[PDB]
A paper describes a structure:
Much of malaria pathology is the result of exponential growth of the parasite within erythrocytes, and given the critical role that protein synthesis plays in this, the translational machinery is an attractive drug target. However, because anti-malarial treatment at the blood-stage requires rapid intervention, we focused on the dominant, blood stage-specific cytoplasmic ribosome from the most virulent form of Plasmodium, P. falciparum (Pf80S), as inhibition of cytosolic translation would be expected to be direct and fast-acting. In this present study, we solved the structure of Pf80S–emetine complex at 3.2 Å resolution and built a fully-refined all-atom model. The ribosome model comprises the large (Pf60S) and small subunit (Pf40S) with a total of 74 proteins as well as the 5S, 5.8S, 18S, and 28S rRNAs and a tRNA bound at the E-site.
The head region of Pf40S has weaker density than the rest of the ribosome due to the inherent flexibility at the neck (centered around h28). This meant that eS31, located in the beak of the 40S head, could not be positioned accurately, and has therefore been omitted from the final model. The largest Pf-specific ESs are concentrated in the 18S rRNA, with ES6S and ES9S being particularly extended. Pf80S co-purifies with a tRNA bound to the E-site. Emetine binds to the E-site of the Pf40S subunit. The emetine binding pocket is formed at the interface between 18S rRNA helices 23, 24, 45, and the C-terminus of uS11. The benzo[a]quinolizine ring of emetine mimics a base-stacking interaction with G973 of h23 and its ethyl group forms a hydrophobic interaction with C1075 and C1076 of h24, whereas the isoquinoline ring is stacked against the C-terminal Leu151 of uS11. The interaction is stabilized by a hydrogen bond formed between the NH group of the isoquinoline ring in emetine and an oxygen atom on the backbone of U2061 of h45. The C-terminus of uS11 adopts a long coil with seven basic residues (residues 141–151; RKKSGRRGRRL), which form electrostatic interactions with the phosphate backbones of h45, h23 and h24, thereby stabilizing the conformation of this coil together with the 18S rRNA. This would explain the molecular basis for resistance whereby mutations of the C-terminal arginine residues of uS11 destabilize h23 and h45, disrupting the binding pocket.
Residue numbers in the entry:
A (entry chain F): 2 to 258
B (entry chain E): 2 to 186
C (entry chain L): 5 to 120, 161 to 213, 216 to 218
RNA sequence: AACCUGGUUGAUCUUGCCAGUAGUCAUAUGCUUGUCUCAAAGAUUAAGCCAUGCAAGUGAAAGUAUAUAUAUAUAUAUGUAGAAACUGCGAACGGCUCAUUAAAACAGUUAUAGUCUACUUGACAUUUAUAAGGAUAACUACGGAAAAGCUGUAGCUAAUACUUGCAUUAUCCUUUUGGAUAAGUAUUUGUUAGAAGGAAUUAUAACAAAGAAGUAACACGUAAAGUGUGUAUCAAUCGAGUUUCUGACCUAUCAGCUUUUGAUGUUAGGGUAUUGGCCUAACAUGGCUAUGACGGGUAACGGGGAAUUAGAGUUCGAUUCCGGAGAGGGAGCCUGAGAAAUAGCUACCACAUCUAAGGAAGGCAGCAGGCGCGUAAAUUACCCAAUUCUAAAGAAGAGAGGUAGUGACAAGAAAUAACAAUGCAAGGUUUGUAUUGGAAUGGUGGGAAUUUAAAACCUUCCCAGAGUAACAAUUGGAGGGCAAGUCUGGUGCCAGCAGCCGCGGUAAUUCCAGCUCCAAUAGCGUAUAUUAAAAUUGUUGCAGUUAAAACGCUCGUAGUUGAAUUUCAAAGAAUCAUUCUUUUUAAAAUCCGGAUUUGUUACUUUGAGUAAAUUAGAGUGUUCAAAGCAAACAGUUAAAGCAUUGUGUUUGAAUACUAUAGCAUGGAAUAACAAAAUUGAACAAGCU
RNA sequence: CCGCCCGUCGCUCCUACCGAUUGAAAGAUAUGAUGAAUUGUUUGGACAAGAAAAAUUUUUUCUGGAAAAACCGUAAAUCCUAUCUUUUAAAGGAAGGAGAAGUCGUAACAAGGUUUCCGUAGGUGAACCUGCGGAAGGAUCAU
């Protein structure tokens, strides 16, 4: 007939799933949801390939059936629910809290995290709609609509967003020296300060992001996620702290162990 | 669908199949290091050749080009591990200077022959195939096996051999014993 | 039917290699007329219903000067910059000039101030006034009745009105 | 491994082909084959035809059960199952094939300010009620038809089927209380007003008119008051449609095409989900083309890629992924969020099955399987265990998928002995090779351990278990090319061989044999194609007096190519004459005497952004290796760590390749082009 | 040089061409005719639910609605041409290549016994001959 595609082939699966070529013909195909399949990750993968709590899809399903895994604090029983960049996972029985982050490679790690910090999540606004009764609503990368957002919030900036209640805490403008994480090409794990934004007329607004080794790298503004003010990040970053080393340096590090 | 389990040719053929000198050389190599075909030689050439090619490529790049330093260094390290170079000759110009003897030396059978164990190369090979020999815990019954210098010292008769302490345990010796017993009784 | 099957600008035959994909839908024209109201529903793409008016009369007509609107029977079609056939057949489309039963506007005016929210000061044209005197006034249609299912329109004014009169002009 | 040998001659040097030579994820076929791993396989011919079986269903709190069964608690109460059917969701995915199709599709690159978008997520609503209206299935009874996934009648009865249909918020006065005015979500029209985006007829707000659909007459019993089902708009998402730019093979023995039949445009409409000659009407006379239009051919689906290459390249790409298309051939619809669906329907054509001859159903380019075609291709196997999908979503299904079977397609590893005595041999005492004879071991046979959904293999152990180690290696050669016989017989310009040159006319180193040798060896030949060899298509990189080849000559359009010229230079510090760095030498605008911008494009440099699989490549003893994407570490079971008795720990699955176009970007050279005098612009004053 | 060899003429084999035959065949478009099915609209109105009257029947109005029909519009298919492409037959004709020690000459290679060769025209069993103007690839680098 011809409509949408329900299946995903295991080689056509996006690399940072890190699936096998063997070990299956297909991949899980993230449900539609709050994240873009190419930059998400289904819950199945998390449960089975990352934490390794499950050996199989079946086990994951079973786990889900006990209403014990929460993603952003409300439960999910959909095995192929997409988790995505910043989202806190609360596996209830272990009393583990994860937050998904990026590695210095493209790969999702589940970070491990405290009760206290778990209660919020960072969310970058994308669009800021006006709706009926001249009320503004931000729309986050979490595919979530924040209504009655504080007026000073502008199109690219992140927002520290509470989970227990839908309301926001604080917001961090997209400034010239704002601690930033990346979430797309090459420099994906990378975490920097920002030197400069280009602001091209018709095109993508390219930005340059100085690291803490002072290695500058550029990136589209699209795929940059504000994470702090110049001093401190508002989230716990992984062990590497977004310092994508050179290849040689990495090898040296590996050797020294 | 097709499987994704990709596979690769390990050995290229000659080109000129009845060149005399080359043939003679091959034969000599076979003689010295107890090899079954020209195929083995070809395989080893291929192995060598890839490395050589890599080295050549690296040399085309300048020093302190990232690629050259990283990949080249890695190659060098690998060579060292393999027992191709060691202390004196670890500079990437040297990995070109490898020949076939250097590689054949590190075959398991050759190593076995060297380190006592068997009277010959052929003998060593048969020993290896006949499930004796071990290279650090693990038994190994392929003579090709390129021993790395890390696991050169840890080569001897396996735990479970007749002449590594685990009963005569043969069709032969056991049978003989049985016969003797019968004779006695 | 919205698709290819057409020469290539260089005038080369596009050799067709594709049936007709339903999303290239060219469902046929509702020649919507005068009469008592009668409208069908055609089911466009994602259950997006659209209202094929096939007979009409009582469209919403606006009076732009004063920026108001009223529902009136429309009594005749008199011009169609597409083609005269349509006007002959009395078919309503999105730029048909038609005649409104124009008592309502007059009534409204009377109610508000005088006799033939309020930024009044403009106070009417001569031609328009004359038209009103006979009861019946020229007015564009502005909805696409065939899609929307309403003959919504507006009263034709000043320069445009004059032009349309000229077009109409009788003469021989 | 950036490679060449034989063949024109009496000999020679060339040109030049032929021949050899190697490879092919490249088919066939011949002979041969003991292990193991891995695994392509009715593409090529006929997108030819198909018997039978199967390939999409779905119910584990949660629409509908007096079919029905059943267990508790006191004839009722709860309950627990539940065939059937209605409803819902799915069946638009997947799978197959490659016929079409050559600026089409596809790839990258935009665009959607020109749209649609079910499920999923998050926001979140507007003009009788202690609960409404019928009418329908299964079912009961009566039927019909040879037959069909045929249905007739009558009678019931549900539903989350179908259909009705019940305060508060914002604007103004008073001290949180009491009044006044309003009060429709999309959508559409007219009138205006205008936190983003480069840009708005955008969001939005108001006014005047219409206006759908909706806002629970639903179902569980849950959580620490919750959920399921449904629902208006918005956003997200899974996408889709269109769309920009750039990019393709052969053919000029295809040069003019397109336009009544929309060709090119403008206007108005119709239509669409939206843009659009997409369609209609009216009006222009355009549009494409030697930078190849338009035809023709393709034994053409495109791409990721494959083979082969030193480097260029050449060929291939039906075929693991992405995209397109198609379900015998066209065409047409219904349903639905999504189909112009084909295990949906209508029709015709072409095939074809049953029929009691009235009718009826049917579509393997799903999986097997069969006939046909053919040089050319496997089982009517077992299972949902893994991977996934669908469902009322652990619990069911799935020929999707996996597992075996056949399998010398390929690919990897690897047996067919080894060793020691004398005997014999040769060498300057040691290697080599005929008798013996104890060790070794797979194979093969049978048990287990394991493996597995269940088996089978793998590995593992234990019994069996080699001397002609009959557990028997072949294939093709021995004139040259080309490694190896002027060994023995047979044939006698016959038979034959011989890719090529040649051999054979009774000494054949070439036939037919035997023996011996050589190569590659569980493989080795033959054929056709292809790459390299081919600098024999030549960009790198050919040749043109005489070898093939300078147009008879000149002019000439496109094409290609185009003199020099415009800021040259200078000084200081480090290093082993050179390298890398700092500073200034004019003019204009900008900033509080100091400090900082200055043609366009090519080109180049950095980026950005790209699927993986393949490729290169890092790591990793799959026993090695082909692989794979895993792993390593500590322990007869605990220390050590770190956590406030409990908890293994370290990690890895890099990186580069992703055009020739597009995006941003540093640029001094080299190129273009633009700026520039029968006159061109720069200031200061004055006048408007 | 008793070398080499050229062409016709016979004979056998194979290849492709021309070929009357409106040759044939399949396929492809293009036109036209008829035109199944069918979206849409229009007409219809078997009937199923209302309203009007009498004691279940009568007459009239409003709703939804099947068949059937008409008109555009998609448009299969069939037939007729036309054109093109592709294989394919054919008496005869006329080439080519191969073969066989066949016929006739001697064209060319030597000053090849008329130097050769070019273009052109005519001739002739056949090689060829001749005319005109060229060339040396001449048998002359020379008065
Ligand atoms: Mg289709
Ligand atoms: Mg053993
Ligand atoms: Mg050849
Ligand atoms: Mg075995
Ligand atoms: Mg076929
Ligand atoms: Mg196939
Ligand atoms: Mg359930
Ligand atoms: Mg049921
Ligand atoms: Mg599909
Ligand atoms: Mg309903
Ligand atoms: Mg027209
Ligand atoms: Mg084709
Ligand atoms: Mg392909
Ligand atoms: Mg084909
Ligand atoms: Mg078929
Ligand atoms: Mg169809
Ligand atoms: Mg089928
Ligand atoms: Mg059919
Ligand atoms: Mg089949
Ligand atoms: Mg085969
Ligand atoms: Mg399963
Ligand atoms: Mg299958
Ligand atoms: Mg030789
Ligand atoms: Mg041969
Ligand atoms: Mg002889
Ligand atoms: Mg012989
Ligand atoms: Mg070639
Ligand atoms: Mg070459
Ligand atoms: Mg040449
Ligand atoms: Mg010549
Ligand atoms: Mg000339
Ligand atoms: Mg010119
Ligand atoms: Mg120049
Ligand atoms: Mg003379
Ligand atoms: Mg003569
Ligand atoms: Mg003569
Ligand atoms: Mg004469
Ligand atoms: Mg004469």
């Amino acid at each position: 007939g011809k409509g949408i595609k329900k299946h995903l082939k295991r080689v056509n699966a996006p690399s940072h799933w890190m699936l096998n070529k063997m070990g299956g013909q297909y991949a899980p195909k993230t449900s539609s949801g709050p994240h873009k399949l190419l930059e998400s990750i289904p819950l199945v993968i998390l449960l089975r390939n990352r934490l390794k709590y499950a050996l199989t899809f079946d086990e994951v399903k079973m786990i889900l059936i006990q209403k014990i895994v929460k993603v952003d604090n409300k439960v999910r029983t959909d095995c192929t629910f997409p988790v995505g960049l910043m989202d806190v996972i609360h596996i209830t029985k272990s009393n583990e809290y994860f937050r998904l982050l990026y590695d210095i490679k493209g790969r999702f790690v589940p970070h491990r995290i405290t009760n206290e910090e778990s209660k919020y999540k960072l969310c970058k606004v994308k669009k800021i709609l006006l709706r009926k009764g001249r009320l503004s609503i931000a729309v986050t990368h979490d595919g979530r609509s924040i209504p009655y957002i504080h007026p000073d919030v502008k199109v690219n900036d992140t927002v520290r967003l509470d989970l227990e209640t839908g309301k926001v805490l604080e917001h961090l403008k997209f400034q010239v020296g704002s601690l930033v994480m990346v979430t797309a090409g090459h420099s994906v794990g990378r975490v920097g300060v920002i030197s400069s934004i280009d602001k091209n007329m018709g095109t993508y607004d390219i930005i340059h992001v100085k690291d803490s080794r002072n290695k500058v790298f550029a990136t589209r503004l699209s795929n940059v996620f504000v994470i702090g003010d110049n001093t401190k990040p508002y989230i716990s970053l992984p062990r590497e702290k977004g310092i994508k080393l050179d290849i040689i340096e990495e090898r040296r590090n590996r050797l020294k162990a | 669908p097709k499987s994704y389990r990709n596979y690769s040719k390990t050995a290229r053929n000659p080109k000129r199949p009845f060149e005399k000198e080359r043939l003679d050389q091959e034969l000599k190599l076979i003689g010295e290091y107890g090899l079954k075909n020209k195929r083995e030689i070809w395989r080893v050439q291929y192995l060598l050749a890839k490395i050589r090619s890599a080295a050549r490529y690296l040399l085309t790049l300048d020093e302190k080009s990232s690629k050259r330093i990283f990949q080249g260094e890695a190659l060098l390290r690998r060579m060292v591990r393999q027992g191709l170079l060691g202390e004196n000759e670890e500079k990437l110009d040297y990995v070109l200077g490898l020949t076939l003897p250097k590689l054949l030396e590190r075959r398991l059978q050759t190593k076995v022959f060297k380190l006592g164990l068997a009277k010959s190369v052929h003998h060593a090979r048969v020993l290896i195939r006949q499930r004796h020999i071990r290279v650090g815990k693990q038994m190994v019954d392929i003579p090709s096996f390129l021993v790395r210098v890390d696991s050169e010292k840890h080569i001897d008769f396996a735990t479970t051999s007749p002449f590594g302490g685990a009963r005569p345990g043969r069709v032969k010796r056991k049978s003989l014993k049985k016969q003797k017993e019968k004779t006695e009784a | 039917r919205d698709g290819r099957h057409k020469l290539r600008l260089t005038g080369g035959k596009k050799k067709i290699h594709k049936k007709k994909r339903k999303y290239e839908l060219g469902r046929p024209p509702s020649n919507t007329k005068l009469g008592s109201r009668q409208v069908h529903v055609v089911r466009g793409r994602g259950r997006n219903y659209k209202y094929r008016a096939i007979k009409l009369d009582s469209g919403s007509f606006s009076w732009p000067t004063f920026g108001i609107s009223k529902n009136t029977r429309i009594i005749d079609v008199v011009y169609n910059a597409s083609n005269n056939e349509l006007v002959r057949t009395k078919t309503l489309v999105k730029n048909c000039i038609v005649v409104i039963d124009s008592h309502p506007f007059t009534t409204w005016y009377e109610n508000t101030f005088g006799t033939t929210k309020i930024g009044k000061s403009k106070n009417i044209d001569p031609l328009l006034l004359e038209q009103f005197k006979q009861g019946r006034v020229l007015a564009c249609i502005s909805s696409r009745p065939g899609q929307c299912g309403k003959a919504d329109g507006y009263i034709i004014e000043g320069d445009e009105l004059l032009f349309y009169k000229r077009k109409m002009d009788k003469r021989n």
